[PDB]
């Protein structure tokens, strides 16, 4: 347990134990000193002003944090495929985290000549927010998670948070948190850290697509013992009204009585990939669906899970109804379509309404001898007893869990971005290099020291997660759809490294391949 | 178990325990950082194009590997001699490997002024491919094994591999392997590594030459009770046909009936050492024997074990039918004959056909009153029930084992380059310096770090192998042939060091000295 | 299926400690013979020394699916590979397991080297190509030689000052120590087992 002894080994691989899968990942990280060892107040004001919808107030801290809330941090593409093609569901159960082989280095810069040396006596502080007393930052789809490729060395993201704001100002109820006011473990090179976590009960994610739709669940050979109004007129001409009824049969499925209806909706604007079909105007924000919270508007994104488009119109997508990842090396601003990957929420069209369509129509008056029957379009429909739906799919590059807000009420708290919702998700893990003062003056001074030895640390991280599988039990005769690689030759291998050594994930990968009845 | 304590001792020597020999070797190695800590895609395309026969696709990794798959890594020339002159066979049984006295050094280069210091907290990763899940690279006669001379300090070879290719392109079934996706042991100076391995049952290598040939196994004093067609004509002239038979006797051994025939063949072109006897044209590749695999041609080298030449024609050798090592200090390209050493596969001429000759002749028609009997030459002959043969000899500088390809079928999987074939040979041992990031920016960045502290490690390796011996039990009256050194004076000692301190192995040394009956 | 081929099993970064004859001539002109050797390296994989060679073969005639490429003559039986048993000839079918064709030439298939099932409802005689299904033995091209190709070449003489080196094509190659191969694949519509004939000898009795 000293300077010349490793404090942990490299564990990286998966084990498939029947109904369970155990993924273990190790990456090597680097932690700089953030904020000059200072807690700093930030707002849209210190950010260079902004619009009201983007106003905020908060603090940036000198701490970093570990984040592995993305599936590719645990599953290799090959494993994701094994999961995807053979199970009807899965979910996390246990988690084991480790920090080891810490190395604190000191940088010296004299006359531009920079040099790095070990500072053996320096420490790094670590602690877990086991009681969720700090603002939960994971599950906001932030960058900075463990890289998908094991060989990549990553930089630990800086921790910051937001509280209540009134423009760029704070309010009485705004909270300020100091992470030093938390007990934390201190470790020198040769010391290590570790902890375990139990995932609370969460339903299995449905990694299947339905092999039949909500409106097509009857026996196509028999009639119902129910009738429907089929004629209100006996033919053109004056006073031709009547009431004729017919049996709802195979010949008219649209009219049949049903026990369950499609899930809720919130109409999204429809955008086309073949640009010339879109309106010649800027509607990215104007024509976007949104919600208001205390005078501020936020984009309804990704919103309720809805099918991306009608059958065949694959060139269409909801303005902000699906997740879109960037391809390897894609820039940050105004990037072209070809440099991004838009997820396709199609498999759920069997139960969820289409995002760019109306939920349906409702009557809006009392038809009478004088007035004709009128209908109106339902653009957004809240929950109704009898509704049934699927949740957003999850992706290899997508988030895994989210913290369910602690509130009096909520409904089906499944994270809208996809994933598992939990009141007590994996705790945040904060880390920071303990400040090491430079030589202080030889005469006392009450001011806090502001002269520090420049340092940064590096080490390994290990995350082991145990997943529970729900295996397939289909009696389907014909073969199923399976995720596969392309047979055809090509310059590079999909999900492999470049000739420059750049790993890249060519496309998003969902979980809905196997099928199941409704 | 710390910084100031040795983590292993120097073990180097052999012990002859009757029917067993235990060789133990220690060398001191150096491991640089390979590929800038990157996995890189490579092909004949990134290699500067090429012909189709040399096309390939694969990856180069940042890992190095240990290789001791050559006899001189374990046997001193004196020991090889003791083995060679006194045993009829031998084979490996157990293996014990060790890595210790690891030292990770950090190099600093400021203004050309380079300086090396210890980085005590740095680690080195090590792991064995115990389940043969990585492409097996040993047993391809690669350079980079432990040096034959104990005092030599060697550099560890870089690991790379190949998968399926279609020209310089990959195919759907092409595999990409990341060695970080393997659990590996991490060690700081003061930590050590070690493992054991059991050689699976392998037949003894025959370290003997036959003291009689396949065609000369009868009693030269008695006749057979079998007859042979000796005359088809009664003398010149018209219609002189008959059928006369004779007893196969001592006077005509060539015609006698035999129970066993010589081993298989694949005719090789014959090249002479006295150049003026060769054709004045380039035939190195054109006139070479080869095999085709999916449109690509590969030199049949070294191919089936066959005798290098007929009796006395020692100046001849098969175009690519024997192994040829380079003499100490010999260059890489277009080196003259005198700077290379060509092995002589002569001792097996007692059972194996000659490489530069035809296997024999076969009839090619039905002789009749009108047609004469015709024969054709057998240039290549596959296995026939009744065949008997010896395998390629093994050399002090030669390979020891090879991995038998995991396939549905194979025949006499003895490595054609000579040695012991095994489904589970000694596992590959991979090592790599764990990357140590240089100072990272003080503002978060999602990109993988590409700035590293330049490092390299060094340490000792120990390989102990237990060999089983099959001792001689001859009733031969006259003395045998023995490998010996030259009595005559000379400038340097054979198998010793130079006046410059350069160790050199003057010639190849086989194992077939003692004799045995057929 | 194998994720690497028999001729591509080395480390593409290191050289062998073995040399090969690279030059027999010093350049055009009279009496220019020599012997130059080179190290078998990454730059010349075709020449490297290897421990294992591809499986046995028995050359099959090559037929194309795009008809206009085939010879205008009846060769279904004449140009077919076969074996004789007591004066009777039988089609070598399906014969040794060999790859159906070279890379990309998917339109080609061995005259009788693969299994061909009929599609549902296909007739019994002289049925067109589109009404049959021809199996593709491609995945084994990593170890088994191509059915419509030669196994390789062998020397056929002694090159000398007067005679040039000569090679001949190996049309059929029996087992050789060091060979490695895969057996014919099995299909959903294919057979499962077979009875190994009760005989004194046999070799790799896989049906």
PDB file of C-alpha atoms in Angstrom, chain C:
ATOM      1  CA  UNK C   1     -16.364 -18.637 -40.407  1.00  0.00           C
ATOM      2  CA  UNK C   2     -12.705 -17.789 -39.860  1.00  0.00           C
ATOM      3  CA  UNK C   3     -11.865 -14.128 -39.209  1.00  0.00           C
ATOM      4  CA  UNK C   4      -8.401 -14.525 -40.778  1.00  0.00           C
ATOM      5  CA  UNK C   5      -6.888 -16.603 -43.594  1.00  0.00           C
ATOM      6  CA  UNK C   6      -4.135 -19.251 -43.603  1.00  0.00           C
ATOM      7  CA  UNK C   7      -1.782 -17.053 -45.601  1.00  0.00           C
ATOM      8  CA  UNK C   8      -2.278 -14.049 -43.335  1.00  0.00           C
ATOM      9  CA  UNK C   9      -1.449 -15.312 -39.832  1.00  0.00           C
ATOM     10  CA  UNK C  10       1.753 -13.418 -39.125  1.00  0.00           C
ATOM     11  CA  UNK C  11       2.484 -10.169 -37.313  1.00  0.00           C
ATOM     12  CA  UNK C  12       2.381  -7.480 -40.015  1.00  0.00           C
ATOM     13  CA  UNK C  13       4.964  -5.418 -38.116  1.00  0.00           C
ATOM     14  CA  UNK C  14       7.880  -7.803 -37.658  1.00  0.00           C
ATOM     15  CA  UNK C  15      10.154  -9.659 -40.069  1.00  0.00           C
ATOM     16  CA  UNK C  16      10.876 -13.354 -39.931  1.00  0.00           C
ATOM     17  CA  UNK C  17      14.374 -14.523 -39.031  1.00  0.00           C
ATOM     18  CA  UNK C  18      14.188 -16.494 -42.274  1.00  0.00           C
ATOM     19  CA  UNK C  19      15.503 -15.537 -45.717  1.00  0.00           C
ATOM     20  CA  UNK C  20      14.317 -16.419 -49.218  1.00  0.00           C
ATOM     21  CA  UNK C  21      15.904 -16.501 -52.659  1.00  0.00           C
ATOM     22  CA  UNK C  22      15.043 -13.116 -54.182  1.00  0.00           C
ATOM     23  CA  UNK C  23      17.397 -12.836 -57.178  1.00  0.00           C
ATOM     24  CA  UNK C  24      18.905 -15.425 -59.523  1.00  0.00           C
ATOM     25  CA  UNK C  25      20.082 -12.800 -61.994  1.00  0.00           C
ATOM     26  CA  UNK C  26      22.060  -9.564 -61.551  1.00  0.00           C
ATOM     27  CA  UNK C  27      20.370  -7.878 -64.495  1.00  0.00           C
ATOM     28  CA  UNK C  28      19.912  -8.491 -68.228  1.00  0.00           C
ATOM     29  CA  UNK C  29      22.883  -9.594 -70.285  1.00  0.00           C
ATOM     30  CA  UNK C  30      25.106 -12.627 -70.636  1.00  0.00           C
ATOM     31  CA  UNK C  31      26.232 -14.715 -67.633  1.00  0.00           C
ATOM     32  CA  UNK C  32      24.457 -12.545 -65.062  1.00  0.00           C
ATOM     33  CA  UNK C  33      23.618 -15.285 -62.575  1.00  0.00           C
ATOM     34  CA  UNK C  34      23.939 -14.891 -58.798  1.00  0.00           C
ATOM     35  CA  UNK C  35      22.105 -15.683 -55.623  1.00  0.00           C
ATOM     36  CA  UNK C  36      20.690 -12.846 -53.564  1.00  0.00           C
ATOM     37  CA  UNK C  37      18.627 -13.450 -50.435  1.00  0.00           C
ATOM     38  CA  UNK C  38      16.244 -11.249 -48.511  1.00  0.00           C
ATOM     39  CA  UNK C  39      14.418 -11.333 -45.216  1.00  0.00           C
ATOM     40  CA  UNK C  40      10.780 -12.376 -45.461  1.00  0.00           C
ATOM     41  CA  UNK C  41       9.096  -9.253 -44.127  1.00  0.00           C
ATOM     42  CA  UNK C  42       5.725  -7.463 -43.936  1.00  0.00           C
ATOM     43  CA  UNK C  43       6.408  -5.993 -47.380  1.00  0.00           C
ATOM     44  CA  UNK C  44       6.416  -9.477 -48.925  1.00  0.00           C
ATOM     45  CA  UNK C  45       3.975 -11.754 -47.119  1.00  0.00           C
ATOM     46  CA  UNK C  46       3.505 -14.055 -50.115  1.00  0.00           C
ATOM     47  CA  UNK C  47       7.032 -15.357 -49.635  1.00  0.00           C
ATOM     48  CA  UNK C  48       7.049 -15.893 -45.871  1.00  0.00           C
ATOM     49  CA  UNK C  49       7.600 -19.297 -44.336  1.00  0.00           C
ATOM     50  CA  UNK C  50       4.457 -20.940 -42.997  1.00  0.00           C
ATOM     51  CA  UNK C  51       3.639 -23.922 -40.790  1.00  0.00           C
ATOM     52  CA  UNK C  52       0.292 -24.872 -42.348  1.00  0.00           C
ATOM     53  CA  UNK C  53      -1.021 -25.082 -45.914  1.00  0.00           C
ATOM     54  CA  UNK C  54      -4.553 -25.143 -47.456  1.00  0.00           C
ATOM     55  CA  UNK C  55      -6.708 -28.256 -47.662  1.00  0.00           C
ATOM     56  CA  UNK C  56      -6.910 -30.809 -50.525  1.00  0.00           C
ATOM     57  CA  UNK C  57      -8.521 -30.138 -53.913  1.00  0.00           C
ATOM     58  CA  UNK C  58     -10.027 -31.720 -57.053  1.00  0.00           C
ATOM     59  CA  UNK C  59     -10.540 -28.993 -59.689  1.00  0.00           C
ATOM     60  CA  UNK C  60     -14.114 -28.437 -60.867  1.00  0.00           C
ATOM     61  CA  UNK C  61     -15.221 -26.806 -64.112  1.00  0.00           C
ATOM     62  CA  UNK C  62     -16.399 -23.206 -63.658  1.00  0.00           C
ATOM     63  CA  UNK C  63     -19.908 -22.240 -64.808  1.00  0.00           C
ATOM     64  CA  UNK C  64     -21.382 -18.729 -64.958  1.00  0.00           C
ATOM     65  CA  UNK C  65     -24.906 -17.613 -64.075  1.00  0.00           C
ATOM     66  CA  UNK C  66     -24.820 -14.980 -66.834  1.00  0.00           C
ATOM     67  CA  UNK C  67     -25.108 -17.542 -69.623  1.00  0.00           C
ATOM     68  CA  UNK C  68     -23.482 -15.579 -72.458  1.00  0.00           C
ATOM     69  CA  UNK C  69     -20.128 -16.102 -70.709  1.00  0.00           C
ATOM     70  CA  UNK C  70     -20.267 -19.894 -70.979  1.00  0.00           C
ATOM     71  CA  UNK C  71     -18.990 -21.830 -73.974  1.00  0.00           C
ATOM     72  CA  UNK C  72     -21.538 -22.501 -76.684  1.00  0.00           C
ATOM     73  CA  UNK C  73     -21.491 -26.293 -76.375  1.00  0.00           C
ATOM     74  CA  UNK C  74     -22.833 -29.092 -74.196  1.00  0.00           C
ATOM     75  CA  UNK C  75     -20.306 -29.683 -71.426  1.00  0.00           C
ATOM     76  CA  UNK C  76     -22.536 -30.599 -68.469  1.00  0.00           C
ATOM     77  CA  UNK C  77     -21.206 -34.157 -68.489  1.00  0.00           C
ATOM     78  CA  UNK C  78     -18.175 -34.002 -70.822  1.00  0.00           C
ATOM     79  CA  UNK C  79     -16.404 -31.255 -68.874  1.00  0.00           C
ATOM     80  CA  UNK C  80     -17.456 -32.616 -65.491  1.00  0.00           C
ATOM     81  CA  UNK C  81     -15.011 -33.915 -62.890  1.00  0.00           C
ATOM     82  CA  UNK C  82     -15.558 -37.591 -62.070  1.00  0.00           C
ATOM     83  CA  UNK C  83     -14.300 -40.806 -60.526  1.00  0.00           C
ATOM     84  CA  UNK C  84     -14.317 -44.383 -61.799  1.00  0.00           C
ATOM     85  CA  UNK C  85     -15.370 -47.486 -59.904  1.00  0.00           C
ATOM     86  CA  UNK C  86     -15.157 -50.791 -61.760  1.00  0.00           C
ATOM     87  CA  UNK C  87     -15.626 -49.305 -65.220  1.00  0.00           C
ATOM     88  CA  UNK C  88     -18.495 -47.026 -64.171  1.00  0.00           C
ATOM     89  CA  UNK C  89     -18.107 -43.254 -63.962  1.00  0.00           C
ATOM     90  CA  UNK C  90     -19.813 -41.205 -61.299  1.00  0.00           C
ATOM     91  CA  UNK C  91     -19.951 -37.430 -61.104  1.00  0.00           C
ATOM     92  CA  UNK C  92     -17.594 -36.099 -58.415  1.00  0.00           C
ATOM     93  CA  UNK C  93     -20.480 -34.493 -56.588  1.00  0.00           C
ATOM     94  CA  UNK C  94     -20.304 -32.598 -54.355  1.00  0.00           C
ATOM     95  CA  UNK C  95     -16.711 -33.725 -53.793  1.00  0.00           C
ATOM     96  CA  UNK C  96     -14.093 -32.149 -51.470  1.00  0.00           C
ATOM     97  CA  UNK C  97     -15.179 -28.967 -49.738  1.00  0.00           C
ATOM     98  CA  UNK C  98     -13.756 -26.031 -51.670  1.00  0.00           C
ATOM     99  CA  UNK C  99     -14.633 -22.356 -51.959  1.00  0.00           C
ATOM    100  CA  UNK C 100     -17.212 -21.752 -54.706  1.00  0.00           C
ATOM    101  CA  UNK C 101     -15.323 -18.867 -56.342  1.00  0.00           C
ATOM    102  CA  UNK C 102     -12.656 -16.149 -56.105  1.00  0.00           C
ATOM    103  CA  UNK C 103     -13.449 -12.841 -54.373  1.00  0.00           C
ATOM    104  CA  UNK C 104     -16.311 -11.006 -56.079  1.00  0.00           C
ATOM    105  CA  UNK C 105     -16.877 -13.410 -58.975  1.00  0.00           C
ATOM    106  CA  UNK C 106     -20.193 -14.396 -57.329  1.00  0.00           C
ATOM    107  CA  UNK C 107     -21.721 -15.245 -60.703  1.00  0.00           C
ATOM    108  CA  UNK C 108     -19.499 -18.337 -60.867  1.00  0.00           C
ATOM    109  CA  UNK C 109     -20.046 -21.778 -59.375  1.00  0.00           C
ATOM    110  CA  UNK C 110     -18.396 -25.218 -59.647  1.00  0.00           C
ATOM    111  CA  UNK C 111     -20.109 -27.503 -62.183  1.00  0.00           C
ATOM    112  CA  UNK C 112     -21.067 -29.937 -59.400  1.00  0.00           C
ATOM    113  CA  UNK C 113     -19.201 -28.657 -56.374  1.00  0.00           C
ATOM    114  CA  UNK C 114     -22.083 -27.328 -54.324  1.00  0.00           C
ATOM    115  CA  UNK C 115     -25.547 -28.502 -53.344  1.00  0.00           C
ATOM    116  CA  UNK C 116     -28.545 -27.139 -55.211  1.00  0.00           C
ATOM    117  CA  UNK C 117     -32.078 -27.397 -53.876  1.00  0.00           C
ATOM    118  CA  UNK C 118     -35.214 -26.634 -55.816  1.00  0.00           C
ATOM    119  CA  UNK C 119     -37.469 -23.714 -54.949  1.00  0.00           C
ATOM    120  CA  UNK C 120     -41.028 -24.525 -53.878  1.00  0.00           C
ATOM    121  CA  UNK C 121     -42.955 -26.148 -56.704  1.00  0.00           C
ATOM    122  CA  UNK C 122     -39.978 -26.471 -59.051  1.00  0.00           C
ATOM    123  CA  UNK C 123     -40.296 -29.254 -61.622  1.00  0.00           C
ATOM    124  CA  UNK C 124     -38.213 -32.391 -62.032  1.00  0.00           C
ATOM    125  CA  UNK C 125     -36.486 -31.913 -65.411  1.00  0.00           C
ATOM    126  CA  UNK C 126     -34.605 -29.197 -67.298  1.00  0.00           C
ATOM    127  CA  UNK C 127     -35.683 -26.456 -64.937  1.00  0.00           C
ATOM    128  CA  UNK C 128     -34.298 -22.951 -65.398  1.00  0.00           C
ATOM    129  CA  UNK C 129     -31.716 -21.324 -63.168  1.00  0.00           C
ATOM    130  CA  UNK C 130     -34.258 -19.066 -61.434  1.00  0.00           C
ATOM    131  CA  UNK C 131     -36.225 -22.093 -60.193  1.00  0.00           C
ATOM    132  CA  UNK C 132     -33.301 -23.596 -58.268  1.00  0.00           C
ATOM    133  CA  UNK C 133     -31.175 -22.476 -55.287  1.00  0.00           C
ATOM    134  CA  UNK C 134     -27.401 -22.979 -55.478  1.00  0.00           C
ATOM    135  CA  UNK C 135     -25.530 -23.079 -52.164  1.00  0.00           C
ATOM    136  CA  UNK C 136     -22.543 -20.848 -51.759  1.00  0.00           C
ATOM    137  CA  UNK C 137     -19.487 -22.371 -50.088  1.00  0.00           C
ATOM    138  CA  UNK C 138     -17.660 -19.070 -49.565  1.00  0.00           C
ATOM    139  CA  UNK C 139     -16.899 -18.746 -45.846  1.00  0.00           C
ATOM    140  CA  UNK C 140     -14.305 -21.550 -46.130  1.00  0.00           C
ATOM    141  CA  UNK C 141     -12.092 -19.665 -48.587  1.00  0.00           C
ATOM    142  CA  UNK C 142      -9.939 -18.836 -45.576  1.00  0.00           C
ATOM    143  CA  UNK C 143      -8.551 -22.387 -45.458  1.00  0.00           C
ATOM    144  CA  UNK C 144      -9.880 -24.429 -48.383  1.00  0.00           C
ATOM    145  CA  UNK C 145      -8.654 -23.841 -51.943  1.00  0.00           C
ATOM    146  CA  UNK C 146     -11.050 -22.512 -54.599  1.00  0.00           C
ATOM    147  CA  UNK C 147     -12.943 -25.283 -56.436  1.00  0.00           C
ATOM    148  CA  UNK C 148     -12.598 -23.790 -59.917  1.00  0.00           C
ATOM    149  CA  UNK C 149      -8.891 -23.017 -59.500  1.00  0.00           C
ATOM    150  CA  UNK C 150      -5.642 -25.007 -59.403  1.00  0.00           C
ATOM    151  CA  UNK C 151      -4.206 -25.944 -56.014  1.00  0.00           C
ATOM    152  CA  UNK C 152      -0.949 -24.321 -57.057  1.00  0.00           C
ATOM    153  CA  UNK C 153       2.191 -24.953 -59.097  1.00  0.00           C
ATOM    154  CA  UNK C 154       5.136 -27.331 -58.753  1.00  0.00           C
ATOM    155  CA  UNK C 155       8.488 -27.478 -60.500  1.00  0.00           C
ATOM    156  CA  UNK C 156       8.628 -30.032 -63.336  1.00  0.00           C
ATOM    157  CA  UNK C 157      12.323 -30.070 -64.240  1.00  0.00           C
ATOM    158  CA  UNK C 158      15.871 -29.192 -63.184  1.00  0.00           C
ATOM    159  CA  UNK C 159      16.641 -25.651 -64.284  1.00  0.00           C
ATOM    160  CA  UNK C 160      20.229 -25.437 -65.523  1.00  0.00           C
ATOM    161  CA  UNK C 161      22.530 -23.371 -67.678  1.00  0.00           C
ATOM    162  CA  UNK C 162      20.671 -24.801 -70.714  1.00  0.00           C
ATOM    163  CA  UNK C 163      17.130 -25.338 -69.417  1.00  0.00           C
ATOM    164  CA  UNK C 164      14.820 -22.768 -67.870  1.00  0.00           C
ATOM    165  CA  UNK C 165      12.853 -23.432 -64.709  1.00  0.00           C
ATOM    166  CA  UNK C 166       9.463 -24.943 -65.493  1.00  0.00           C
ATOM    167  CA  UNK C 167       6.284 -25.253 -63.502  1.00  0.00           C
ATOM    168  CA  UNK C 168       3.082 -27.201 -63.938  1.00  0.00           C
ATOM    169  CA  UNK C 169      -0.401 -26.746 -62.531  1.00  0.00           C
ATOM    170  CA  UNK C 170      -1.660 -28.952 -59.721  1.00  0.00           C
ATOM    171  CA  UNK C 171      -5.221 -29.781 -60.744  1.00  0.00           C
ATOM    172  CA  UNK C 172      -5.908 -32.181 -57.879  1.00  0.00           C
ATOM    173  CA  UNK C 173      -3.982 -32.474 -54.634  1.00  0.00           C
ATOM    174  CA  UNK C 174      -4.313 -35.233 -52.086  1.00  0.00           C
ATOM    175  CA  UNK C 175      -3.629 -34.794 -48.378  1.00  0.00           C
ATOM    176  CA  UNK C 176      -0.175 -33.579 -47.307  1.00  0.00           C
ATOM    177  CA  UNK C 177       1.145 -33.437 -43.763  1.00  0.00           C
ATOM    178  CA  UNK C 178       0.529 -29.870 -42.621  1.00  0.00           C
ATOM    179  CA  UNK C 179      -2.797 -29.358 -44.383  1.00  0.00           C
ATOM    180  CA  UNK C 180      -5.694 -27.693 -42.625  1.00  0.00           C
ATOM    181  CA  UNK C 181      -9.308 -27.320 -43.797  1.00  0.00           C
ATOM    182  CA  UNK C 182     -13.002 -26.789 -43.043  1.00  0.00           C
ATOM    183  CA  UNK C 183     -15.741 -29.257 -43.955  1.00  0.00           C
ATOM    184  CA  UNK C 184     -18.779 -28.546 -46.085  1.00  0.00           C
ATOM    185  CA  UNK C 185     -21.330 -26.371 -44.300  1.00  0.00           C
ATOM    186  CA  UNK C 186     -24.701 -27.788 -43.322  1.00  0.00           C
ATOM    187  CA  UNK C 187     -28.071 -26.272 -44.326  1.00  0.00           C
ATOM    188  CA  UNK C 188     -31.571 -25.945 -42.925  1.00  0.00           C
ATOM    189  CA  UNK C 189     -32.780 -28.016 -45.929  1.00  0.00           C
ATOM    190  CA  UNK C 190     -29.668 -30.192 -45.916  1.00  0.00           C
ATOM    191  CA  UNK C 191     -28.895 -33.690 -44.590  1.00  0.00           C
ATOM    192  CA  UNK C 192     -27.919 -34.239 -40.954  1.00  0.00           C
ATOM    193  CA  UNK C 193     -25.992 -37.513 -40.793  1.00  0.00           C
ATOM    194  CA  UNK C 194     -24.669 -40.321 -42.955  1.00  0.00           C
ATOM    195  CA  UNK C 195     -23.557 -43.888 -42.359  1.00  0.00           C
ATOM    196  CA  UNK C 196     -19.797 -44.284 -42.603  1.00  0.00           C
ATOM    197  CA  UNK C 197     -19.219 -47.311 -44.853  1.00  0.00           C
ATOM    198  CA  UNK C 198     -17.920 -50.318 -42.948  1.00  0.00           C
ATOM    199  CA  UNK C 199     -14.500 -50.676 -44.562  1.00  0.00           C
ATOM    200  CA  UNK C 200     -10.896 -51.391 -43.623  1.00  0.00           C
ATOM    201  CA  UNK C 201      -9.938 -47.781 -44.128  1.00  0.00           C
ATOM    202  CA  UNK C 202     -11.231 -44.277 -44.630  1.00  0.00           C
ATOM    203  CA  UNK C 203     -10.055 -40.740 -44.053  1.00  0.00           C
ATOM    204  CA  UNK C 204     -11.908 -37.940 -42.262  1.00  0.00           C
ATOM    205  CA  UNK C 205     -15.264 -39.745 -42.816  1.00  0.00           C
ATOM    206  CA  UNK C 206     -17.217 -36.496 -42.600  1.00  0.00           C
ATOM    207  CA  UNK C 207     -20.056 -36.907 -45.191  1.00  0.00           C
TER     208      UNK C 207
END
